[PDB]
Structure 1
Amino acid sequence: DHSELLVNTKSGKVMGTRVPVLSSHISAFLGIPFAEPPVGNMRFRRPEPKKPWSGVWNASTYPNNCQQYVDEQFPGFSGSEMWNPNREMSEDCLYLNIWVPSPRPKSTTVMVWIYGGGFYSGSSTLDVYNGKYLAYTEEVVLVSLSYRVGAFGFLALHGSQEAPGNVGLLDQRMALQWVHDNIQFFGGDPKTVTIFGESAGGASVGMHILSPGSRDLFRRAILQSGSPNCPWASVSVAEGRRRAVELGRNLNCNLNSDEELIHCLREKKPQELIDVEWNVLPFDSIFRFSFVPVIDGEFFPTSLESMLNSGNFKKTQILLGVNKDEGSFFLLYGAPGFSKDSESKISREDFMSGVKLSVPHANDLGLDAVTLQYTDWMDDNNGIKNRDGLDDIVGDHNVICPLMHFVNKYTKFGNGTYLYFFNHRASNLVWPEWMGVIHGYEIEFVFGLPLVKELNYTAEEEALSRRIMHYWATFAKTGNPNEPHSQESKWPLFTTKEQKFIDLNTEPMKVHQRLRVQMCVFWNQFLPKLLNAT
C-alpha cells in the first residue's frame, strides 16, 4: 500500500495504469464497479451498490459494454463503427473509468461524462470518449460512467418492483453517488462535479437536474444536443407498460400478469430481446426505439413541463448547445431517399413522407402546417432545398427547439446559462457533405482528438478544440466558461431578455441572439396549440 496508481476507496483498493498522452503520461483507473452485476433476477431491477471487495481491484483495462443493438448499416465504415461497442457486451456492465492528472491532484475539478445513444446503445469505452486529452490538458479528474440501455435499462411495468422503469437513470445516479463518495481519494473535489453528456446523455443530464433524488450529487451541468424534454426521450407509464407487453408478445410470453411477463423476459438471452426490440414501437417514425425514461411520479415527481414551469429543479449554472445539422443522421438511417453515397436530393414526394415520419403524432392540418413553414414556395421542387428542409425539420423538432424550450424555462430560475451553436464541419469528416455539421460531431472537439496529429485535423481545428476544452473545463471549475481577466473574446451569459449565444467554430467569435426563434416559436408554441385545438 502506497504508489500513484494505487488508490484506496470506501469500496476497496484499486490499481490504475499509466497511460501516455500528448508526449506525457497520466493515470487511468478503468473498469471500477459501482454496482452489483444486474444479472439473473436482477435484470430490469434497480441497481444495488457494489459490495466492497478485499484485495486490489485491477483497474487497468476497459470494462465490458452493456448489451445493445449494434449498428451494421455500414460494415467497415469508420463513421458508424466508431460508435459501436468496442468491448465484449455483457449484462455485467456497470463500471466507470477515471482519468487522473499526474502527479495526482489534491482537490481539483471533476467532470463526469454520460454517453448518448438514444437510450438503446452507447459505451463509455469508445475512442472518442477517451478522457485522457481533457484530463491532461485541463487538469481535471475525468469520469466516464455507464448504464443499461434498451429494455435492460428501461423496460417499464409501473407498479412492479421487479421492472419499475428508469433503472438506467438509476444506474447513472449510483455512479454519481460513487463519485460523490470516493472521487476525493483520486484527488477530485466532490463539491465541484460537473455532469456532461450528449444527445440521450445530454437529456439524462437534464433529467438529473430535474429529479430530486439526483440533484444533490453534482454541482453543475453541460448538455450537448439533448434536453430532458426531447420528444424521443420519455414516455408515460401507460405507454411504457404497453410497450413492455408488446415486447413480451414478440417473445411468446405469458401475458397474464406483470410477474408472468417479467419472469419470461428474464429468461431470454440478451440477444433475444435485442432481435425483436424494434418491433414494438406502435407508429412509424424517424426514431424506432421503444425503451426510454418514464414519467413515473418518483424519479420525476410530475410532468417534465410542470416541473420546468414551476422551477421544480436544481438551480445552478448550465452550459449547453446544439450542432447546426442535428437532423442529418436520423434522416440517413430512417427516411427514404437518403443514402450515404448520393447527394440525397429529395423528391417532393419523398419530402412529404419525410415530414409524416418526422411528426408522427400530427394530424393532416399539422402536417400541412409543418410543410408550409419549411417550403420555399418560389422553388418548391428543388431537391436540395427539400433535403435541407427536412434536415431542419427533424433537427428543430427533435433537438434544437426542445433545447431552446428547456433553456428558456431554466434560465428563468437558474443561476447562469451559457449557450452555443457549433457549426464547424470537421475537415476530415468521413460522412457525406450533404450531412453538414452532424449531430454528434462536436464530441471529438470536446474530448480534444484534434490535438492528436495522426488524426489529420487542421491546425485551426486543434485550436478550436483547445478553446472548447477550456471553456468546458473553466465552466466546470467556476460556473463561467470565461477566464476572469483574460483578453479573449467574452462568451456572454444567456439571459431571459437578451438570449445571447455564440457560434462555436474556427473564425473569430460572434455573438447572436434568439437561436432559431422563428422555427422554435412554431414548434414550441404554434404547432402544439394547433394539434390541441384540432
Structure 2
Amino acid sequence: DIIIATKNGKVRGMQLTVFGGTVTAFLGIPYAQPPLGRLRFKKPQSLTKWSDIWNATKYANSCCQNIDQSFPGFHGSEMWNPNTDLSEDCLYLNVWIPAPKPKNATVLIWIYGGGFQTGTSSLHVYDGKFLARVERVIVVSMNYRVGALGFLALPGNPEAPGNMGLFDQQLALQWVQKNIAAFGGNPKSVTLFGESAGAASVSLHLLSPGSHSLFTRAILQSGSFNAPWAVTSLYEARNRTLNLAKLTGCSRENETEIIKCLRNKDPQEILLNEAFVVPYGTPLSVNFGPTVDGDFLTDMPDILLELGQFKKTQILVGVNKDEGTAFLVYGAPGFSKDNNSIITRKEFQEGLKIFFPGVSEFGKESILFHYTDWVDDQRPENYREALGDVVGDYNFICPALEFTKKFSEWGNNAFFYYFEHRSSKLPWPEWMGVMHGYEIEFVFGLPLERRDQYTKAEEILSRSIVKRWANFAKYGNPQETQNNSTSWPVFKSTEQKYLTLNTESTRIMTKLRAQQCRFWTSFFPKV
C-alpha cells in the first residue's frame, strides 16, 4: 500500500512493474475545482481539501474536445484521440515516481500538444513510467482545457478572460511546487517539457511572470509561441467569441450576457460550432488559443522575446525532419496516406491555397518561387516534397530556430536537435518520412520495452535521448557522458550548431534551413 499525504488530502497510488523493477503511479489526482456551471470559461479555482483517501489508480476524464474522424480504424490518427471519457470535469494530473521513493528527485512536467483544441495526458506515448524507472526522475502530466472551453476570450472580462487552459497548466505547476516533496520530488528542480502546442505552452510559461518561479528549465519539441498558429490576435479572438455566440444563438449586447448564455449551452453545442468560427481554416487552424490577456501574457509575446523579457534559464529545443507531411492528408489536393502522393504543380498551387487562405496571391507565388527552383525539374516527387517542407518550415522549424536564436542572445545556454529517425513501426506511409509527433515515443522510452517490436537500434536511440533529456533536466546539460557519445554543443547566434538524432551517427551541423528560414523569417512576414 502506498499513500502520500498532500496539502488537500491523502492519495493512494498503484505499483507497476517496469523492466524488472517498480514504479509507483498516481493517476488522476485532482488539482482544481471542476470548471463546471458558473466556473465554465473561468480561471481554474483552487481545490477545497478532502479528508479520506483519494484513489489515484486510473487516468481521469480528458477535457471536452473534437476528435479526429478522418481515418476511423487507422492507428496513425487514432493513437492521438482521447482514451478516457471526455468531461468538463477533467482538471487532473498524473505523478509517476521511482520505487523506492526517491529522496529529492528531479521533476519532468509534460504538457501535451494538439493545437490547443485537443489532446490528453493519458495517451500511451505520454506514459511516464519508463522515465521514472530508467532515470529515476518523477514524471508529472496534467489535463488542461482545450478549445473554446479553454481559450475563449472576451478580453478583460473574468467571465471569459482568455488563456484559461494556460492557467490550468499553471495551477498544476503550483500543485507540484506545494506537493511534490511529499512524493520524493524536488520542487527546485522542475523541467517543463511538451510537444507542438504543448511546446508553445512551455515557451509562454517562459514568458509568464506567474510561471517564473514554478519551474527551473524548459524543453520545447516541435513548437514555440512564435509559430504562426500559436497566438490568436485580440481582433481574431473577439470575432471568434462573437461568431461562436452568433452560432449558438447567444448573441447579446451585454458581453457578460453572451457568456452566461454560453454557459447554458452544452459542451457538444459549443464543440460542434468551433470549426466554423473562421471563414476558412486550415488543417493547422487554432481557432481558440492563447491571447494577450494582460494577465498570463502581458504583451505581444514577439515583443517580450525580442526585448529579452523572459525567464533566464537553459532551453532545449528541437524539431523533426518532416514536420509538415502529416498535415497534407487533411485537405491538400492529390495527397493520400494510401498512395505515394506524387502531386502536380497545379496541385502544389491549390495546396498553398489550402494552407495559406488569405494569403495575397503574391504571398503564395513567393512561396512557390522560393520552393520550386528545382535541382532538377526531373524528379516526380519534387512538388510533393516541397509542399511538406513549406508546411513544416513555416509552421514549426523556422519559428523554433528563431525562438532559439533570440532566446540565446540574452545569454543563456540553449541546445537545438534535429530529429531524423523514422519509427520502424510508423503506420503512415514512407513518403511522410520523419513525421511531426513521432519523436515523443523515443523521448518517453517506449522503445526500451523490448516486448514491443522496435528494432535494436531504436532501443539504443531512445535510451540515449532519455539520458540526454534527463541530464538536461537535472543538470542543464543534455549530454550522454558515458558511451563515447557526440558532445552536444550549445546553440549560439553566429554559429547555430545543432545536433542530429538518428540511429546511424549523430552529427554536429550548423544553420539548419538557413535559406528557407531567411525566407519565412525575413521576407514572408511582410506579405
TM-score with structure 1 length normalisation? 0.96
Per the TM alignment, residue 273 of structure 1 is displaced from its structure 2 partner at its CA by 1.2
The amino acid that maps onto 1:177 is: Q
Corresponding residue for residue 165 of structure 1? 162
Corresponding residue for residue 320 of structure 2? 323
Per the TM alignment, residue 149 of structure 1 is displaced from its structure 2 partner at its CA by 0.1
Corresponding residue for residue 495 of structure 1? 492
Cα root mean square deviation, aligned:
1.4
Per the TM alignment, residue 303 of structure 1 is displaced from its structure 2 partner at its CA by 1.3
Equivalent residue for 1:58, pick from 49, 55, 59: 55
Equivalent residue for 2:223, pick from 223, 226, 230: 226
- Asked whether 1:268 is paired with 2:258, we answer no
- Asked whether 1:362 is paired with 2:359, we answer yes
Corresponding residue for residue 10 of structure 2? 13
Corresponding residue for residue 73 of structure 2? 76
1:256-289 deviation line (CA, Å, top 9, x unaligned) = 2212211221111111111121111233434233
| Distance of 1:419 and 1:480 partners within structure 2 | 12
Corresponding residue for residue 469 of structure 1? 466
Equivalent residue for 1:107, pick from 104, 109, 132: 104
**Conserved 8 A contact 2:218-2:316:** yes
**Conserved 8 A contact 1:278-1:289:** no
Residues 84-99 of structure 1: pairs in structure 2 closer than 5 A = 84-99=81-96
| Distance of 2:274 and 2:457 partners within structure 1 | 43
1:335-367 deviation line (CA, Å, top 9, x unaligned) = 222111011111211111212232334312221
The 1:372–1:253 alpha-carbon spacing in structure 2 relative to 1, beyond 3 Å, is same
Per the TM alignment, residue 484 of structure 1 is displaced from its structure 2 partner at its CA by 5.7
Residues 42-53 of structure 1: pairs in structure 2 closer than 5 A = 42-53=39-50
* Count, aligned residues: 527
| Distance of 1:401 and 1:267 partners within structure 2 | 42
Corresponding residue for residue 121 of structure 1? 118
**Conserved 8 A contact 1:348-1:381:** no
1:286-334 deviation line (CA, Å, top 9, x unaligned) = 4233110002232222111111111000010001100000001111113
| Distance of 2:451 and 2:97 partners within structure 1 | 24
Corresponding residue for residue 140 of structure 1? 137
Moved more, 431-440 or 411-420: 411-420
Equivalent residue for 1:246, pick from 238, 243, 247: 243
Corresponding residue for residue 506 of structure 1? 503
Corresponding residue for residue 183 of structure 1? 180
Corresponding residue for residue 234 of structure 2? 237
**Conserved 8 A contact 2:374-2:382:** no
**Conserved 8 A contact 1:347-1:381:** no
| Distance of 1:172 and 1:484 partners within structure 2 | 33
| Distance of 1:357 and 1:521 partners within structure 2 | 23
TM-score with structure 2 length normalisation? 0.98
- Asked whether 1:334 is paired with 2:326, we answer no
**Conserved 8 A contact 1:324-1:422:** yes
The 1:377–1:465 alpha-carbon spacing in structure 2 relative to 1, beyond 3 Å, is closer
- Asked whether 1:306 is paired with 2:308, we answer no
Corresponding residue for residue 447 of structure 1? 444
The 1:179–1:209 alpha-carbon spacing in structure 2 relative to 1, beyond 3 Å, is same
1:238-259 deviation line (CA, Å, top 9, x unaligned) = 2111101111111122332212
The 1:193–1:47 alpha-carbon spacing in structure 2 relative to 1, beyond 3 Å, is same
The amino acid that maps onto 1:190 is: P
| Distance of 1:72 and 1:283 partners within structure 2 | 19
The amino acid that maps onto 2:59 is: Y
Equivalent residue for 1:154, pick from 151, 154, 161: 151
Residues 408-487 of structure 1: pairs in structure 2 closer than 5 A = 408-483=405-480, 487=484
The amino acid that maps onto 2:315 is: I
The amino acid that maps onto 2:421 is: H
The 1:459–1:377 alpha-carbon spacing in structure 2 relative to 1, beyond 3 Å, is closer
The 1:526–1:112 alpha-carbon spacing in structure 2 relative to 1, beyond 3 Å, is same
The amino acid that maps onto 1:151 is: A
Corresponding residue for residue 373 of structure 2? 376
Corresponding residue for residue 285 of structure 1? 282
| Distance of 1:147 and 1:259 partners within structure 2 | 24
The 1:228–1:414 alpha-carbon spacing in structure 2 relative to 1, beyond 3 Å, is farther
% identical aligned pairs: 53
| Distance of 1:267 and 1:223 partners within structure 2 | 37
Corresponding residue for residue 517 of structure 1? 514
**Conserved 8 A contact 1:337-1:346:** yes
Per the TM alignment, residue 471 of structure 1 is displaced from its structure 2 partner at its CA by 0.4
Corresponding residue for residue 258 of structure 1? 255
| Distance of 1:403 and 1:254 partners within structure 2 | 39
The 1:221–1:39 alpha-carbon spacing in structure 2 relative to 1, beyond 3 Å, is same
Unaligned runs of 5+ in 2: none
| Distance of 1:453 and 1:488 partners within structure 2 | 23
Unaligned runs of 5+ in 1: none
1:482-526 deviation line (CA, Å, top 9, x unaligned) = 156764221111112211001100012210001111100110012
Q: Secondary structure at the match of 1:235?
A: coil
| Distance of 1:307 and 1:361 partners within structure 2 | 27
Per the TM alignment, residue 415 of structure 1 is displaced from its structure 2 partner at its CA by 1.9
Q: Secondary structure at the match of 2:210?
A: helix
The 1:267–1:494 alpha-carbon spacing in structure 2 relative to 1, beyond 3 Å, is same
| Distance of 1:37 and 1:424 partners within structure 2 | 40
| Distance of 2:411 and 2:37 partners within structure 1 | 42
**Conserved 8 A contact 1:317-1:414:** no
Equivalent residue for 1:353, pick from 344, 350, 375: 350
| Distance of 1:105 and 1:378 partners within structure 2 | 56
Moved more, 382-391 or 157-166: 382-391
The 1:483–1:434 alpha-carbon spacing in structure 2 relative to 1, beyond 3 Å, is closer
1:431-488 deviation line (CA, Å, top 9, x unaligned) = 1111100000000000111112232100000000000011000100000011567642
**Conserved 8 A contact 2:115-2:285:** no
The 1:455–1:45 alpha-carbon spacing in structure 2 relative to 1, beyond 3 Å, is same
